[PDB]
């Protein structure tokens, strides 16, 4: 164990900033490993493999190290190469592919260290590219194979071209032929910005191909990647080269899942920093290397924010670059990447806070500039990305005493109030109020912005003292109020609710009066509302037996609490959890006529996504319970064989999981049906009226449909068949069907 922990720490120490030059530490580490070679061969091989798989940002270093070991022990190099091939095959079979990319890159860089012969790796990359010639195969897998090839190229391209220029040219021709005839249907769904200026959000494969071509035009002369092995030009040159075995890629299987396509998040230019080192161009492989290294650094240390910030700040490079701008750009790319960020968003905001703390003289200005540029380009930003931006900016301001030069954004006052910029400002102020008190937000915005401030979060009771008595249900409301103040029981509340002149089993006036009084009396805190809802839960169940009752309860709750959207969301959450209203009722309420004015607000879609997440978590929980029961049944059966009620319980759990899956299917079907209905209604109205179809309402609605698809692709891949057969058909309007087609191409 001591030898194990020691060796691990030792192998993971190389790379960290040290007084001794990197070359000296590498040589010492190689010598130490060779010294203990004959007793820990397998351990050393496994440690090096896992380090190559889990620390891509340090790639070159470890690469060199292997070469140094190969420069002394040929057998070690051969065994290590075989282990790498085996690990890569395991990763491909394991359906994880980022590790496969990192291992392929490690192998590619091993060529520079004179560990692997160039011709063998040229053959391996030839097979990679020839995978694009397969028939009846998802485009995602061909895309990934070409991506692995082109991403390995920045590291071993010089050597491969110098050794096998003809075969490399043929491989490039095949890659160009493939890239010419690719499908770009998925791009608009994933682009953060639809605008072509000032920075197109080009597809990742197209961007990488452009950068590789620029590098090839530059005679493969790159100026960023560290190449420690160069310092050992002598030592590494006398080493004998190994030959890879003919590598055939694992055959496509129906169980195979491939990484989804991504769009490069470009938002900075060299002109944005006219004082620091020149920023590498968008179509320069240096930019890609920097972005990938920073993404890997974030992924490795995504848990601890302080360590991640320290590592990001101290990212080394052959030539100086504007590190602050690169860090901000990659962090925003992670936050805004679609379908979902690699990690949680609160992590990104806190990491930006920590980075600003680490570098308080430069980074805050870069963050302010980035925020201003993000605001300026709001006219075409994705609504999902707009929500993420709103949340991040609200949290940032909350962390910095809600200080900002709002006057710089004064241009949003003049234009339409529903437009992306004033809408973003309103939603940001609403979130800021959510993280503070209403009066605190009125004191920070300049008086000219008062129109965009949030409304006071106060309850609206229809049966107030000033309210007229003509409204039916005033006496009953007063009686219910006094009963509530008297610590009433459910039976006597039912008794008082007995006397209601039913306008029509389901009474709308009864539900209205009850819910209004209950919410008004518990309109001081969330705890009070929770206690009142739970205490009178039986009344809710009795009055909300039917779907109409649940919809009316939701409508009345919205009417009472419309200036306090956080209260709406919390109350809906509690009602769903308590089973007062199902998820279908909430989904129908979101598209109800009452919420047409608030349809484009962020809290509505937060509520919808929270309900979907609740359903997903419920299904997962019941599935986990069923799996645990089945596993314990198998364990008991095997133990008994080695030497009735449980089967009934298993069948009951199977029934419950089947019901939960059916409920999830119904929820998603209902949501898609309502989205289709609203969008087709708008499109028909625009066609008959001869007006423009691209309006803020349409943009928001279509982007929210896209948001549902993107967030819950993992669960909609199951319903794919019924979605294609019932909702999304040929007869559907092309505008709406485009979202479904893009979702289809996302993982196909």
């Amino acid at each position: 164990n001591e030898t194990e922990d020691h060796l691990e720490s030792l192998i993971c120490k190389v790379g960290e900033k040290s007084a001794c030059s990197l070359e000296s530490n590498l040589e010492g580490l190689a010598g130490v490993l060779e010294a203990d070679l004959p007793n820990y061969k397998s351990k050393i091989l496994r440690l090096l493999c896992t380090v190559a798989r889990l620390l891509p940002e340090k790639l070159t270093i470890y690469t060199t190290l292997v070469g140094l070991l190969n420069a002394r022990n040929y057998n070690f190099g051969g065994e290590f190469v075989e282990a790498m091939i085996r690990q890569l095959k395991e990763s491909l079979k394991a359906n994880n592919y980022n590790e496969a990319v990192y291992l392929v890159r490690f192998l590619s860089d091993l060529v520079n260290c004179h560990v692997i012969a160039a011709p063998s790796m040229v053959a391996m990359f030839e097979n990679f590219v020839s995978v694009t010639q397969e028939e009846d195969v998802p485009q995602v897998r061909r895309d990934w194979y070409v991506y692995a090839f082109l991403s390995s190229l920045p590291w071993v391209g010089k050597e491969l071209y110098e050794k096998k220029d003809a075969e490399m040219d043929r491989i490039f021709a095949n890659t160009e032929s493939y890239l010419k005839r690719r499908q770009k249907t998925h791009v608009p769904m994933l682009q953060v910005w639809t605008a072509d200026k000032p920075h197109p959000q080009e597809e990742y494969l197209d961007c990488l191909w452009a950068q590789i071509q620029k590098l090839k035009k530059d005679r493969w002369q790159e100026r960023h990647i560290l190449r420690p092995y160069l310092a050992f030009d002598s030592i590494l040159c006398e080493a004998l080269q190994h030959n890879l075995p003919p590598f055939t890629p694992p055959p496509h299987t129906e169980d195979s899942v491939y990484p989804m396509p991504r769009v490069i998040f470009r938002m900075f230019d060299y002109t944005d920093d006219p004082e620091g080192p020149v920023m590498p161009g968008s179509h320069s492989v240096e930019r890609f290397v920097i972005e990938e290294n920073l993404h890997c650094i974030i992924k490795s240390h995504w848990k601890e924010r302080k360590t991640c910030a320290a590592q990001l700040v101290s990212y080394p490079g052959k030539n100086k670059i504007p590190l602050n701008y690169h860090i901000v750009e990659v962090i925003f790319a992670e936050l805004f990447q679609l379908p979902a960020p690699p990690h949680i968003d609160v992590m990104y905001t806190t990491l930006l806070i920590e980075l600003c703390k680490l570098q308080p003289g430069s980074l805050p200005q870069v963050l302010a500039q980035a925020t201003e540029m993000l605001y300026m380009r709001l006219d075409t930003m994705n609504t999902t990305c707009v929500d993420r931006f709103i949340n991040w900016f609200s949290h940032h301001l909350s962390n910095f005493q809600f200080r900002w030069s709002w006057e710089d954004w004064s241009d949003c006052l003049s234009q339409d109030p529903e437009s992306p910029k004033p809408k973003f400002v309103r939603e940001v102020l609403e979130k800021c109020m959510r993280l503070s008190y209403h009066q605190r937000i009125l004191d920070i915005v300049p008086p000219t912005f008062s129109a965009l401030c949030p409304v006071n979060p106060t309850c609206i009771y229809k049966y107030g003292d000033e309210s007229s008595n003509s409204l039916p249900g005033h006496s009953v409301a007063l009686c219910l109020a006094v009963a509530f103040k008297s610590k009433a029981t459910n039976d006597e509340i039912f008794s008082i609710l007995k006397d209601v002149p039913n306008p029509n089993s389901f009474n709308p006036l009864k539900i209205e009066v009850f819910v209004q009084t209950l919410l008004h009396l518990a309109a001081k805190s969330f705890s009070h509302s929770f206690s009142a809802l739970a205490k009178f839960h039986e009344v809710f169940k009795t009055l909300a037996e039917s779907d109409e009752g649940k919809l009316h309860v939701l409508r009345v709750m919205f009417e009472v609490w419309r200036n306090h959207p956080q209260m709406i969301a919390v109350l809906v959450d509690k009602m769903i959890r308590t089973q007062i209203v199902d998820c279908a009722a909430v989904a129908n309420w979101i598209f109800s006529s009452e919420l047409s004015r608030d349809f484009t607000r962020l809290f509505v879609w937060e509520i919808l996504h929270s309900t979907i997440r609740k359903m997903n978590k419920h299904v997962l929980k019941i599935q986990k319970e069923l799996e645990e029961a089945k596993e314990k049944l198998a364990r008991q059966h095997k133990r008994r064989s080695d030497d009735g009620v449980l089967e009934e319980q298993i069948e009951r759990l199977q029934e419950k999981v089947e019901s939960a899956q059916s409920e999830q299917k119904n929820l998603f079907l209902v949501i898609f049906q309502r989205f289709i209905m609203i969008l087709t209604e708008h499109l028909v109205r625009c066609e008959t009226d001869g007006t423009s179809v691209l309006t803020p309402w349409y943009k928001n609605c279509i982007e929210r449909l896209q948001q549902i698809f993107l967030q819950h692709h993992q669960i909609i891949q199951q319903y794919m068949v019924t979605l294609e057969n019932l909702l999304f058909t040929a007869e559907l309007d092309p505008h709406i069907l485009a979202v479904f087609q893009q979702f289809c191409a996302l993982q196909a």
């Binding site: 703390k357 003289g361 710089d408």
Partner: peptide
């Protein structure tokens, strides 16, 4: 562990922005 330095930096930055707009 007080980040008063960062707070002062942000305050000065926003003050400079406001002054530049005013001028």
């Amino acid at each position: 562990e007080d980040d008063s330095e960062l707070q002062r930096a942000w305050g000065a930055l926003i003050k400079e922005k406001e002054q530049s707009r005013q001028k």
